């Protein structure tokens, strides 16, 4: 499973652009689909969503009413055109897949991203911790508040935990505050009540040294946090 | 021909024959242990609260 | 709405898996399914080859109708623990072979298996498209052998036409529900070419017999 | 010789009834009189499962019971999910005509059979977000009436060509035939610490079967027509029998014979399905008069009727954790009721 | 106004009286039970055809009391109505009237659909569908009926003797469009015949029933349709053109009874002939022994 994406580059302000991202080696029709922005320094800032068989469109408010994203399911391939671009809009977009069922795992798969650089009522999530010091083979617990209570009437804690290692595209660890992604080694657990969550890293290694970053999906402008980077 | 399998439904029988067999009312008192201990733990006997219950619509 | 984003997200999923189904229920309903039970093995092959593991299915085309039809005689097990399955078919293709009536008989053994299907309670009202196949060699052996040796009584005499009709006569007197289904006999060979269009027929009048049955008009 | 075989066949069939004629002292009637009664108890549809477009032939509950899995004979494999009546999975199937349906433990592979002589896994938590056919088991020459799952890698199925076997998934391959059935086998459950299996014929007999060694250790008789249903006790050491004699015949294991017999005079239509609630007290059955007929396993007496469908009830399952009871039926319905 | 519409009167009246109230009683009552019939199988209220038998069933249940409300209260009990309820009774005759023609229609339709498609009938005409076809020509019956309870109201103009405060104006767009109809019939049911013989002229050439048993039971109806409707509608015709001052109003005012009788005959003709209604009759009767 490989989802490659093309555009970006320089464009000047009040630009248009269109970013293409290729789908391939899976079923692109029945993934449900979003773009992650993330700009230069801060962190990663959800943009848009497309359903399988484009059936709901959800948008930022940053982005409303300038940015169309639209799915050709035939050809596999994402579509975000923006017009009217500011300076803001300085990021590196992602392109994220995510199925929606009993036990799915969205945003399982990110794209490795195409960096776009412009010419010169939400649930926010607070990580307080922007850096902590670590020391291989120890344990570390990253802490996560959330402002609204993240957990629902029908039972799950709707919290997701992120990894972006230096140089590379976010991965899934935990899914609904507690449930390992496909992959992601036993070592990591989460824990969580509704409005503080935790996440656990036990016999840490070289591969775990990122920036953690927590995502709350129980209302649609899902809001990211800024991210915990563990360094030695 | 249909000896050898004839010689194997004895053979099969045989070893049927010699298994231990318990009591009828051992087994029946054992059966109605098991229905009385776990019949707190049966939701289809017994009626479960609304709000327990899973399927409330 | 009292529903968080997956959970609109799952509905959302369930309802196009519902659009897919009932596209797919569409094109099955559209499917014309017919089950090919020949006694034996005698004229199975040949209607096969002519109009183109448990179930062998075999799907053709014909003025624009999707026919799919059901060889289950290689099952080799008890008929009526999987005979329901095939309740609801549109028509049954019997194949029964006319040379075997020296070859107990052979045709004896075919009028109980029709006994079997066409009197059975899963098949009151699907109707049934006799096949008497092997007309060449039932021609070429009656000028040398008789009626008598299958069927006791027969006062008509060597002559094809009249033995031909005999077995026919034979075959429509096997079933016992007369009004609710009808049985339709061609007398086919390897070298005939219409065996698709009699099916084609057939089956368009049973259609139409279901549909008015339905609409009330019958 | 022949002669003297059927002979000492015979007669130590003849020894066998006799020593369940003696260890045969009391009557599970005479034992649970004194009990008090079950109660009349009535379930209501929780929840109707549409969708369907043909005769659901079979279904079963997953682990954790809240996903189901249901066989039809339109081609669809669609995995329920029974809080929400939400389709999770719709697999398209090679073959039309199933007749089983199962739930891996686990809930990563579900396996349906029929008239295709092959019951293929498919792997549901699997990438592509697509499911697949994990392997397709081929070497059964009769109709697959009945698959069901140990782990991930074993699955034990019931064939018409009087021949049930287990198969190792990877390999693809019979890792024990189990022969001995002389009619098609139509029915086949599980222990709940799966070692051993039962498994119910036309030939009026339900023999138990060792998964390990490989040869039967119990053959249980009674019937006067073939099994279509069967089903393992919760505690493990009894199982029912349903029959198209329109009687639920519960057998024991410790002292091989028949406690009660599940029959009335008003139900003359076969069981196609049987299952036990937890705690073992109800005894669900499938009739062919559209109906889901209650029992009570200690007393013959019966406790409730579910007439809520409009064909017959081909497949029936308690959820593990007792609280739900899903009943299919030809009618492309698939009722909870609770 | 209607002082010049009274014409019939004496023993007359008190027969025509009995025998209407009768017909209506009788119609109300058997349309009432195919309906329930209907309603209750929870086996052919989900059949496409049988809704639409069902909406001709309650037409003619609507036709048969309103119908022989208003003539027995008009003309035998010489009651005297007010414009609003007057004309409201007139818009409802003729919705109940046009709807039943509307039914037929739909019916002749479904058989066509029968034929001319047989392997798609199912997929080509569904529940849902059948529904919106029936709200549509239910609600197109009603705006062309009710056009008199608000379109005219006969201004300064001839107004047809035969229906008083109807202006010659809505006879006439009625007659054309139920005319059309009745063509629609005739035309899908002529359709249906040909179908069938040229359907059993094909089969016959492989190897007289189909073909026959159709054009039995198609005449049958079209034969009972036309001596019941077309009697009235010839007299319409005759009171759109000429002076409408004759006696022949009381002709029509007996003659239109026939309509009542094809309401009765509506039923027997088209619900009791399919064996569903009998079967579910049956198990109603079964359900009715306890
Ligand atoms: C223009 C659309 C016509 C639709 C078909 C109508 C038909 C069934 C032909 C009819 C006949 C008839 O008397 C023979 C009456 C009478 C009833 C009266 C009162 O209610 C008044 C109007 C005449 C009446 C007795 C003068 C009708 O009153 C709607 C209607």
Same mark, same amino acid.
Request: hydrophobic share 40%.
């Given at each position: 499973?490989?989802?490659?994406?093309?555009?970006?580059?320089?464009?000047?302000?009040?630009?248009?652009?269109?970013?293409?991202?290729?789908?391939?080696?899976?079923?692109?029709?029945?993934?449900?689909?979003?773009?992650?922005?993330?700009?230069?320094?801060?962190?990663?800032?959800?943009?848009?969503?497309?359903?399988?068989?484009?059936?709901?469109?959800?948008?930022?408010?940053?982005?409303?009413?300038?940015?169309?994203?639209?799915?050709?399911?035939?050809?596999?391939?994402?579509?975000?055109?923006?017009?009217?671009?500011?300076?803001?809009?300085?990021?590196?977009? $992602?392109?994220?897949?995510?199925?929606?069922?009993?036990?799915?795992?969205? /945003?399982?798969?990110? %794209?490795? +991203? &195409?960096?776009? *650089?412009?010419?010169?009522?939400?649930?926010?999530?607070?990580?307080?911790?922007?850096?902590?010091?670590?020391?291989?083979?120890?344990?570390?617990?990253?802490?996560?508040?959330?402002?609204?209570?993240?957990?629902?009437?029908?039972?799950?804690?709707?919290?997701?935990?992120?990894?972006?290692?230096?140089?590379?595209?976010?991965?899934?660890?935990? $899914?609904?505050?507690?449930?390992?992604?496909?992959?992601?080694?036993?070592? /990591?657990?989460?824990? %969580?009540? +509704? &409005?503080?969550? *935790?996440?656990?890293?036990?016999?840490?290694?070289?591969?775990?040294?990122?920036?953690?970053?927590?995502?709350?999906?129980?209302?649609?402008?899902?809001?990211?946090?800024?991210?915990?980077?563990?360094?030695? | 021909?249909?000896?050898?399998?004839?010689?194997?439904?004895?053979?099969?029988?045989?070893?049927?024959?010699?298994?231990?067999?318990?009591?009828?009312?051992?087994?029946?008192?054992?059966?109605?242990?098991?229905?009385?201990?776990?019949?707190?733990?049966?939701?289809?006997?017994?009626?479960?609260?609304?709000?327990?219950?899973?399927?409330?619509? | 709405?009292?529903?968080?984003?997956?959970?609109?997200?799952?509905?959302?999923?369930?309802?196009?898996?519902?659009?897919?189904?009932?596209?797919?229920?569409?094109?099955?309903?559209?499917?014309?399914?017919?089950?090919?039970?020949?006694?034996?093995?005698?004229?199975?092959?040949?209607?096969?080859?002519?109009?183109?593991?448990?179930?062998?299915?075999?799907?053709?085309?014909?003025?624009?109708?999707?026919?799919?039809?059901?060889?289950?005689?290689?099952?080799?097990?008890?008929?009526?623990?999987?005979?329901?399955?095939?309740?609801?078919?549109?028509?049954?293709?019997?194949?029964?072979?006319?040379?075997?009536?020296?070859?107990?008989?052979?045709?004896?053994?075919?009028?109980?298996?029709?006994?079997?299907?066409?009197?059975?309670?899963?098949?009151?009202?699907?109707?049934?498209?006799?096949?008497?196949?092997?007309?060449?060699?039932?021609?070429?052996?009656?000028?040398?052998?008789?009626?008598?040796?299958?069927?006791?009584?027969?006062?008509?005499?060597?002559?094809?036409?009249?033995?031909?009709?005999?077995?026919?006569?034979?075959?429509?007197?096997?079933?016992?529900?007369?009004?609710?289904?009808?049985?339709?006999?061609?007398?086919?060979?390897?070298?005939?070419?219409?065996?698709?269009?009699?099916?084609?027929?057939?089956?368009?009048?049973?259609?139409?017999?279901?549909?008015?049955?339905?609409?009330?008009?019958? | 010789?022949?002669?003297?075989?059927?002979?000492?066949?015979?007669?130590?069939?003849?020894?066998?009834?006799?020593?369940?004629?003696?260890?045969?002292?009391?009557?599970?009637?005479?034992?649970?009189?004194?009990?008090?009664?079950?109660?009349?108890?009535?379930?209501?549809?929780?929840?109707?499962?549409?969708?369907?477009?043909?005769?659901?032939?079979?279904?079963?509950?997953?682990?954790?019971?809240?996903?189901?899995?249901?066989?039809?004979?339109?081609?669809?494999?669609?995995?329920?999910?029974?809080?929400?009546?939400?389709?999770?999975?719709?697999?398209?199937?090679?073959?039309?005509?199933?007749?089983?349906?199962?739930?891996?433990?686990?809930?990563?592979?579900?396996?349906?059979?029929?008239?295709?002589?092959?019951?293929?896994?498919?792997?549901?938590?699997?990438?592509?977000?697509?499911?697949?056919?994990?392997?397709?088991?081929?070497?059964?020459?009769?109709?697959?009436?009945?698959?069901?799952?140990?782990?991930?890698?074993?699955?034990?199925?019931?064939?018409?060509?009087?021949?049930?076997?287990?198969?190792?998934?990877?390999?693809?391959?019979?890792?024990?035939?189990?022969?001995?059935?002389?009619?098609?086998?139509?029915?086949?459950?599980?222990?709940?610490?799966?070692?051993?299996?039962?498994?119910?014929?036309?030939?009026?007999?339900?023999?138990?079967?060792?998964?390990?060694?490989?040869?039967?250790?119990?053959?249980?008789?009674?019937?006067?027509?073939?099994?279509?249903?069967?089903?393992?006790?919760?505690?493990?050491?009894?199982?029912?029998?349903?029959?198209?004699?329109?009687?639920?015949?519960?057998?024991?294991?410790?002292?091989?014979?028949?406690?009660?017999?599940?029959?009335?005079?008003?139900?003359?239509?076969?069981?196609?399905?049987?299952?036990?609630?937890?705690?073992?007290?109800?005894?669900?059955?499938?009739?062919?008069?559209?109906?889901?007929?209650?029992?009570?396993?200690?007393?013959?007496?019966?406790?409730?009727?579910?007439?809520?469908?409009?064909?017959?009830?081909?497949?029936?399952?308690?959820?593990?954790?007792?609280?739900?009871?899903?009943?299919?039926?030809?009618?492309?319905?698939?009722?909870?009721?609770? | 106004?209607?002082?010049?519409?009274?014409?019939?009167?004496?023993?007359?009246?008190?027969?025509?009286?009995?025998?209407?109230?009768?017909?209506?009683?009788?119609?109300?009552?058997?349309?009432?039970?195919?309906?329930?019939?209907?309603?209750?199988?929870?086996?052919?209220?989900?059949?496409?055809?049988?809704?639409?038998?069902?909406?001709?069933?309650?037409?003619?249940?609507?036709?048969?009391?309103?119908?022989?409300?208003?003539?027995?209260?008009?003309?035998?009990?010489?009651?005297?109505?007010?414009?609003?309820?007057?004309?409201?009774?007139?818009?409802?005759?003729?919705?109940?009237?046009?709807?039943?023609?509307?039914?037929?229609?739909?019916?002749?339709?479904?058989?066509?659909?029968?034929?001319?498609?047989?392997?798609?009938?199912?997929?080509?005409?569904?529940?849902?569908?059948?529904?919106?076809?029936?709200?549509?020509?239910?609600?197109?019956?009603?705006?062309?009926?009710?056009?008199?309870?608000?379109?005219?109201?006969?201004?300064?103009?001839?107004?047809?003797?035969?229906?008083?405060?109807?202006?010659?104006?809505?006879?006439?767009?009625?007659?054309?469009?139920?005319?059309?109809?009745?063509?629609?019939?005739?035309?899908?049911?002529?359709?249906?015949?040909?179908?069938?013989?040229?359907?059993?002229?094909?089969?016959?050439?492989?190897?007289?029933?189909?073909?026959?048993?159709?054009?039995?039971?198609?005449?049958?109806?079209?034969?009972?349709?036309?001596?019941?409707?077309?009697?009235?509608?010839?007299?319409?015709?005759?009171?759109?053109?000429?002076?409408?001052?004759?006696?022949?109003?009381?002709?029509?005012?007996?003659?239109?009874?026939?309509?009542?009788?094809?309401?009765?005959?509506?039923?027997?003709?088209?619900?009791?002939?399919?064996?569903?209604?009998?079967?579910?009759?049956?198990?109603?009767?079964?359900?009715?022994?306890?």
């Amino acid at each position: 499973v490989q989802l490659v994406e093309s555009g970006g580059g320089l464009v000047q302000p009040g630009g248009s652009r269109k970013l293409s991202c290729s789908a391939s080696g899976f079923a692109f029709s029945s993934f449900g689909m979003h773009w992650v922005r993330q700009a230069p320094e801060k962190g990663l800032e959800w943009v848009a969503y497309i359903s399988s068989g484009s059936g709901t469109i959800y948008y930022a408010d940053t982005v409303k009413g300038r940015f169309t994203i639209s799915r050709d399911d035939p050809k596999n391939t994402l579509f975000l055109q923006m017009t009217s671009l500011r300076s803001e809009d300085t990021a590196m977009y $992602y392109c994220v897949r995510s199925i929606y069922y009993y036990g799915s795992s969205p /945003f399982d798969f990110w %794209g490795q +991203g &195409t960096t776009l *650089t412009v010419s010169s009522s939400d649930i926010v999530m607070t990580q307080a911790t922007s850096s902590v010091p670590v020391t291989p083979g120890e344990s570390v617990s990253i802490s996560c508040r959330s402002s609204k209570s993240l957990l629902h009437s029908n039972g799950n804690t709707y919290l997701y935990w992120f990894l972006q290692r230096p140089g590379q595209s976010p991965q899934l660890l935990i $899914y609904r505050m507690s449930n390992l992604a496909s992959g992601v080694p036993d070592r /990591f657990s989460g824990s %969580g009540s +509704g &409005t503080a969550f *935790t996440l656990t890293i036990s016999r840490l290694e070289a591969e775990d040294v990122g920036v953690y970053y927590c995502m709350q999906h129980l209302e649609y402008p899902l809001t990211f946090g800024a991210g915990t980077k563990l360094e030695l | 021909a249909s000896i050898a399998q004839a010689r194997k439904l004895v053979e099969q029988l045989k070893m049927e024959a010699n298994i231990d067999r318990i009591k009828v009312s051992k087994a029946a008192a054992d059966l109605m242990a098991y229905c009385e201990a776990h019949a707190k733990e049966d939701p289809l006997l017994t009626p479960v609260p609304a709000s327990e219950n899973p399927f409330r619509e | 709405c009292t529903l968080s984003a997956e959970d609109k997200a799952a509905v959302e999923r369930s309802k196009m898996i519902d659009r897919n189904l009932r596209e797919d229920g569409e094109k099955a309903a559209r499917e014309v399914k017919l089950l090919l039970l020949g006694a034996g093995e005698s004229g199975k092959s040949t209607i096969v080859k002519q109009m183109k593991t448990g179930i062998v299915e075999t799907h053709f085309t014909f003025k624009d109708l999707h026919f799919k039809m059901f060889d289950v005689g290689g099952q080799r097990s008890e008929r009526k623990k999987w005979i329901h399955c095939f309740e609801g078919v549109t028509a049954i293709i019997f194949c029964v072979a006319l040379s075997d009536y020296d070859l107990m008989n052979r045709m004896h053994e075919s009028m109980k298996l029709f006994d079997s299907i066409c009197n059975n309670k899963w098949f009151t009202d699907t109707s049934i498209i006799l096949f008497l196949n092997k007309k060449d060699l039932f021609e070429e052996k009656i000028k040398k052998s008789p009626l008598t040796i299958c069927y006791p009584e027969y006062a008509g005499s060597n002559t094809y036409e009249e033995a031909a009709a005999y077995i026919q006569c034979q075959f429509e007197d096997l079933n016992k529900r007369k009004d609710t289904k009808e049985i339709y006999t061609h007398f086919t060979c390897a070298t005939d070419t219409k065996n698709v269009q009699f099916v084609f027929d057939a089956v368009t009048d049973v259609i139409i017999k279901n549909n008015l049955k339905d609409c009330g008009l019958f | 010789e022949l002669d003297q075989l059927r002979q000492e066949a015979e007669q130590l069939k003849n020894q066998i009834r006799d020593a369940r004629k003696a260890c045969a002292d009391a009557t599970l009637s005479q034992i649970t009189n004194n009990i008090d009664p079950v109660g009349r108890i009535q379930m209501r549809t929780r929840r109707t499962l549409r969708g369907h477009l043909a005769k659901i032939y079979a279904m079963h509950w997953g682990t954790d019971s809240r996903l189901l899995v249901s066989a039809s004979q339109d081609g669809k494999l669609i995995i329920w999910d029974s809080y929400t009546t939400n389709k999770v999975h719709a697999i398209p199937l090679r073959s039309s005509w199933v007749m089983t349906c199962a739930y891996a433990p686990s809930g990563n592979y579900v396996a349906c059979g029929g008239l295709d002589n092959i019951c293929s896994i498919y792997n549901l938590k699997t990438r592509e977000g697509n499911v697949r056919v994990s392997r397709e088991l081929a070497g059964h020459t009769g109709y697959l009436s009945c698959c069901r799952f140990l782990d991930d890698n074993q699955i034990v199925t019931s064939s018409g060509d009087t021949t049930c076997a287990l198969w190792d998934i990877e390999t693809g391959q019979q890792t024990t035939t189990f022969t001995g059935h002389t009619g098609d086998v139509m029915s086949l459950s599980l222990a709940p610490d799966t070692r051993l299996f039962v498994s119910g014929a036309c030939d009026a007999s339900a023999k138990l079967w060792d998964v390990r060694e490989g040869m039967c250790r119990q053959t249980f008789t009674g019937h006067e027509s073939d099994i279509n249903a069967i089903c393992f006790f919760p505690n493990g050491n009894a199982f029912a029998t349903g029959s198209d004699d329109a009687t639920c015949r519960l057998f024991d294991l410790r002292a091989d014979q028949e406690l009660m017999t599940y029959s009335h005079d008003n139900i003359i239509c076969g069981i196609t399905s049987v299952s036990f609630s937890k705690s073992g007290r109800l005894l669900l059955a499938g009739y062919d008069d559209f109906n889901c007929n209650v029992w009570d396993a200690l007393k013959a007496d019966r406790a409730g009727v579910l007439a809520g469908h409009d064909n017959r009830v081909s497949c029936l399952g308690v959820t593990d954790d007792g609280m739900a009871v899903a009943t299919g039926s030809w009618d492309s319905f698939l009722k909870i009721w609770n | 106004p209607m002082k010049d519409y009274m014409i019939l009167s004496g023993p007359q009246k008190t027969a025509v009286a009995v025998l209407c109230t009768l017909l209506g009683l009788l119609s109300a009552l058997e349309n009432v039970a195919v309906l329930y019939l209907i309603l209750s199988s929870h086996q052919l209220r989900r059949k496409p055809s049988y809704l639409f038998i069902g909406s001709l069933a309650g037409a003619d249940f609507l036709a048969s009391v309103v119908f022989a409300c208003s003539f027995v209260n008009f003309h035998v009990f010489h009651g005297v109505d007010s414009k609003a309820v007057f004309l409201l009774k007139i818009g409802s005759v003729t919705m109940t009237f046009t709807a039943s023609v509307g039914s037929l229609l739909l019916t002749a339709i479904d058989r066509y659909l029968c034929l001319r498609y047989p392997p798609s009938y199912k997929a080509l005409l569904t529940r849902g569908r059948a529904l919106v076809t029936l709200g549509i020509m239910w609600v197109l019956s009603a705006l062309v009926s009710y056009l008199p309870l608000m379109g005219w109201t006969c201004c300064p103009r001839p107004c047809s003797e035969l229906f008083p405060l109807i202006p010659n104006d809505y006879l006439l767009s009625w007659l054309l469009f139920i005319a059309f109809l009745f063509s629609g019939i005739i035309y899908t049911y002529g359709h249906v015949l040909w179908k069938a013989h040229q359907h059993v002229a094909s089969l016959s050439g492989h190897q007289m029933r189909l073909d026959v048993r159709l054009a039995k039971t198609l005449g049958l109806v079209l034969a009972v349709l036309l001596i019941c409707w077309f009697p009235v509608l010839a007299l319409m015709a005759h009171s759109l053109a000429t002076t409408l001052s004759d006696q022949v109003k009381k002709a029509f005012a007996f003659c239109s009874m026939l309509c009542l009788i094809n309401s009765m005959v509506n039923p027997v003709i088209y619900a009791l002939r399919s064996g569903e209604i009998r079967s579910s009759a049956h198990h109603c009767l079964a359900h009715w022994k306890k």
